Amino acid sequence: AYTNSFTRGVYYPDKVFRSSVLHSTQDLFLPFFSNVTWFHFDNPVLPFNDGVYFASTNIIRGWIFGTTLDSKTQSLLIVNNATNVVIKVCENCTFEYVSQPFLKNLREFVFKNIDGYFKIYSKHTPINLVRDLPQGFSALEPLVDLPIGINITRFQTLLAGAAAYYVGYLQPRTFLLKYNENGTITDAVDCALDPLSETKCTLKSFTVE
Amino acid sequence: CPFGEVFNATRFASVYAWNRKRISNCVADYSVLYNSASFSTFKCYGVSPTKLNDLCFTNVYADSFVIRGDEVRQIAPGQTGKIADYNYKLPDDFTGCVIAWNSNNLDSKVGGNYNYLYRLFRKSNLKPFERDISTEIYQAGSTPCNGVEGFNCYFPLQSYGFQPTNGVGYQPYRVVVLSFEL
Amino acid sequence: VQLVESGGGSVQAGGSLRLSCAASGKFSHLVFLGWFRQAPGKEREGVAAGLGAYESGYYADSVKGRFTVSLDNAENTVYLQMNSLKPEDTALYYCAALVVLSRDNTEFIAHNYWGQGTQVTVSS
Ligand SMILES: *[C@@H]1O[C@H](CO)[C@@H](O)[C@H](O)[C@H]1NC(C)=O
Ligand SMILES: *[C@@H]1O[C@H](CO)[C@@H](O)[C@H](O)[C@H]1NC(C)=O
Ligand SMILES: *[C@@H]1O[C@H](CO)[C@@H](O)[C@H](O)[C@H]1NC(C)=O
Ligand SMILES: *[C@@H]1O[C@H](CO)[C@@H](O)[C@H](O)[C@H]1NC(C)=O
């Protein structure tokens, strides 16, 4: 079962603040029009592949990250169990973390883990009708920078009529974000998708002639 | 604040298992560094040793091990000798401060200290910051005599030995490599 | 963190013993280097090795096919078996333990330790 993510999955790649300029960055992004798997038993343990785009429409409680999930390796079970969210990496405790909870809507997350750091983005745009993944462009803001660095290559979702959640895999492709006046991202073109859309990355605009 | 422990610690790690005690989130005054009679080599690379109080730098790593006399000059960026080929590599862009002082009152027994080993042979040529803690056999020569361990194959770890009658070239020098990037 | 040996004494040749290196203290993996044999007035040689995560039996040629090691993760210990004792193997043996106190992935605080000494005097 495949669904087509239209243009979603763009986060702020940096921590600086720009304004009204067309920035060109090179990082791990979700490709445009990439095949994303519908998961309508429900939770097979899936690989990591240096970054996955989780996106589900409170039935979802969280995710479990690790290598094989026993008492041998350290796990990472990101669970929103209490009125506030907790994060446990124990199996023997090395780290814990409590913050404001992460919890129709459209919950999106872009997980990535590179060089000892665990990064996690978020968004909470609302949607009523089920275009499965909507067409609108919205950015993602990072929640926490987690310097734990457990080698993670497997992830499995905690849970509790069938529910839906999508997972699409990241790749090293470069984008071209359009920053707005205020400082938000409102559009982005891909520099590897279409032979039209390559020319918007080597002419540094959104209009060609 | 956070690195009075990494310098004055009773024992130090050996070259294959280099410590990587990581410090963050307190002020590092550096006033007990670069003016001290105990130190012997303070050769910072890409950053001057002066003007280090007035900067603010993040994710500063503090490596540690012990090496002998004529091996301090292999912790430079580059200079492929013996312990930089297989044991400890400092990447070419470094931004750091190798601090190689002298310790012969602490790290020498009556019959020689043997707690500071190193890796003489290794099949693999290393990557920067790549620990190679595994102790598998080296197979010197194209020879399938694997399990015998007599010759044409070597157990890679080997001990230093530190007797206090030895010369300046082979006394142990407790280096400390403060590494930091932006 | 200390180390404890056992299996020592004076025993006739062609008999048997069992060498055991016992650990204690606070650690996380205790990856073994192995047993080390030092002849009197000589250098110690790597008589037993290959006890890591992925490993293979490393025995020197002088005791090849005669002595065996075993990975005992109950106390994080090791057992060296003695078969067909011979006065060439007369040595003060050492066990070599790489302790590690590094619960994180990055800050690899890991000193290097050795044992005490086993009096193995055999003769025909
Ligand atoms: C959630 O789990 C944490 C441990 O990770 C625990 O401390 C907390 O009390 C739990 N909250 C509840 C009651 O759901
Ligand atoms: C937990 O830590 C102890 C040492 O405190 C160690 O022996 C054990 O293997 C570790 N793993 C488990 C089983 O939780
Ligand atoms: C910026 O924010 C202000 C206040 O919310 C709003 O009135 C304005 O329209 C925004 N401008 C843009 C271009 O987003
Ligand atoms: C170690 O102790 C000496 C003498 O007290 C002192 O000069 C030196 O700064 C100390 N090193 C650190 C950083 O702990």
Side-chain angles (χ1 to χ4, degrees):
Chain A
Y2 276 159
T3 79
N4 194 32
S5 84
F6 284 94
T7 181
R8 288 178 170 272
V10 171
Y11 51 90
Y12 297 153
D14 292 336
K15 305 230 179 311
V16 302
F17 152 71
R18 307 197 165 86
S19 159
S20 294
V21 71
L22 307 181
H23 204 52
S24 176
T25 174
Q26 186 173 355
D27 215 356
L28 303 166
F29 289 143
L30 195 68
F32 284 168
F33 303 87
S34 168
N35 297 131
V36 193
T37 78
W38 201 343
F39 285 141
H40 78 95
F41 317 124
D42 300 17
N43 46 7
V45 179
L46 272 153
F48 210 53
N49 208 322
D50 54 66
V52 280
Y53 166 74
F54 187 87
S56 165
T57 69
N58 187 26
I59 172 66
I60 288 287
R61 298 289 176 180
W63 307 268
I64 301 180
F65 296 96
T67 78
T68 185
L69 262 298
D70 45 12
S71 66
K72 285 160 60 70
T73 176
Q74 297 171 1
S75 44
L76 161 49
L77 53 97
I78 306 176
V79 48
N80 209 139
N81 72 325
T83 55
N84 56 38
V85 66
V86 305
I87 288 172
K88 198 209 76 165
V89 175
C90 317
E91 61 185 13
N92 292 5
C93 266
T94 69
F95 175 75
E96 80 165 342
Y97 178 58
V98 194
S99 45
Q100 291 203 354
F102 311 138
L103 191 66
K104 282 180 55 185
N105 306 332
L106 180 67
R107 287 170 280 265
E108 322 182 33
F109 297 97
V110 177
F111 304 119
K112 75 155 54 164
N113 183 84
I114 182 76
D115 190 76
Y117 278 107
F118 200 67
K119 296 180 174 305
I120 173 173
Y121 311 115
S122 86
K123 206 43 188 176
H124 284 340
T125 82
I127 183 59
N128 306 70
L129 187 145
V130 69
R131 284 108 200 170
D132 44 36
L133 275 78
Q135 293 177 335
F137 201 61
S138 309
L140 280 83
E141 327 176 2
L143 256 289
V144 281
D145 211 36
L146 279 156
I148 303 301
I150 173 64
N151 175 38
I152 301 175
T153 175
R154 300 261 277 277
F155 94 105
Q156 182 194 16
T157 81
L158 276 186
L159 264 173
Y165 67 103
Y166 318 118
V167 168
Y169 283 91
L170 295 186
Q171 275 153 33
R173 284 137 62 86
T174 189
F175 272 179
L176 192 139
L177 321 165
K178 172 180 178 184
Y179 285 90
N180 216 7
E181 178 193 11
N182 287 359
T184 173
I185 283 185
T186 198
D187 218 328
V189 295
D190 186 18
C191 307
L193 174 64
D194 210 6
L196 158 74
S197 176
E198 189 85 44
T199 76
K200 297 176 198 174
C201 284
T202 174
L203 260 60
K204 292 301 173 201
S205 90
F206 268 54
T207 56
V208 308
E209 275 89 9
Chain B
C1 324
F3 59 97
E5 176 261 328
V6 73
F7 278 104
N8 297 339
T10 310
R11 55 196 65 213
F12 263 78
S14 63
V15 202
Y16 74 107
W18 77 76
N19 300 338
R20 211 204 175 86
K21 164 68 76 180
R22 170 186 179 156
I23 41 171
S24 299
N25 305 350
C26 208
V27 69
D29 50 26
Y30 280 58
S31 44
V32 306
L33 269 75
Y34 191 72
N35 43 4
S36 312
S38 296
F39 284 1
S40 169
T41 288
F42 209 112
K43 298 289 202 90
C44 305
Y45 300 132
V47 170
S48 68
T50 324
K51 314 180 166 193
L52 261 172
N53 313 70
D54 315 326
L55 295 163
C56 187
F57 41 82
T58 49
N59 64 271
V60 40
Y61 290 116
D63 300 336
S64 295
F65 43 100
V66 287
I67 52 173
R68 56 173 175 178
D70 64 280
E71 286 189 9
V72 175
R73 55 97 178 173
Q74 323 193 27
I75 319 293
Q79 192 40 255
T80 298
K82 186 191 301 292
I83 68 180
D85 196 306
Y86 321 112
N87 287 226
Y88 182 75
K89 187 88 194 41
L90 275 204
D92 289 345
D93 289 345
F94 179 54
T95 323
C97 274
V98 282
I99 289 171
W101 50 289
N102 167 44
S103 78
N104 222 37
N105 193 30
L106 307 99
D107 305 327
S108 201
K109 265 305 292 177
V110 59
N113 217 44
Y114 280 72
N115 303 13
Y116 302 134
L117 288 71
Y118 82 123
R119 179 183 295 281
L120 168 66
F121 281 106
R122 191 75 219 117
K123 144 199 172 177
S124 68
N125 196 356
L126 202 65
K127 211 153 300 293
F129 293 146
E130 205 190 19
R131 190 142 39 241
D132 219 10
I133 198 183
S134 180
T135 77
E136 293 177 350
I137 209 169
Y138 172 81
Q139 60 171 24
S142 273
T143 297
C145 302
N146 300 122
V148 284
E149 210 257 346
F151 274 98
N152 308 7
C153 47
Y154 292 125
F155 159 66
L157 297 203
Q158 201 269 330
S159 159
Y160 273 150
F162 292 132
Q163 314 267 9
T165 318
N166 211 340
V168 56
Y170 309 114
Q171 292 161 55
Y173 284 156
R174 294 183 172 181
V175 316
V176 164
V177 186
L178 269 81
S179 161
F180 42 83
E181 282 156 40
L182 296 194
Chain C
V1 177
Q2 311 179 14
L3 276 187
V4 165
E5 296 97 304
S6 44
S10 277
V11 53
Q12 312 278 315
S16 198
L17 294 182
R18 185 173 218 204
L19 268 300
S20 282
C21 174
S24 44
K26 269 75 61 179
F27 35 80
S28 160
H29 309 141
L30 258 175
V31 195
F32 283 99
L33 297 201
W35 281 102
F36 275 68
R37 165 159 74 169
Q38 195 161 6
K42 301 299 156 304
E43 201 77 30
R44 42 194 65 166
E45 187 45 87
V47 61
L51 280 77
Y54 290 99
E55 74 268 41
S56 158
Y58 293 154
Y59 304 99
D61 190 62
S62 197
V63 298
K64 177 64 177 67
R66 274 197 51 239
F67 293 154
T68 47
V69 301
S70 73
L71 173 64
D72 181 275
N73 310 90
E75 177 75 60
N76 313 274
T77 59
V78 71
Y79 309 134
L80 179 52
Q81 220 55 58
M82 286 293 98
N83 310 333
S84 73
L85 318 172
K86 187 158 54 183
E88 320 162 3
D89 309 338
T90 42
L92 218 64
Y93 288 83
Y94 295 82
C95 60
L98 170 52
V99 310
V100 47
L101 289 89
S102 88
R103 295 206 154 276
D104 287 332
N105 181 38
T106 51
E107 50 178 2
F108 185 58
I109 305 296
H111 305 156
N112 211 326
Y113 273 87
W114 291 71
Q116 176 64 255
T118 79
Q119 196 61 76
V120 192
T121 79
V122 309
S123 198
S124 50

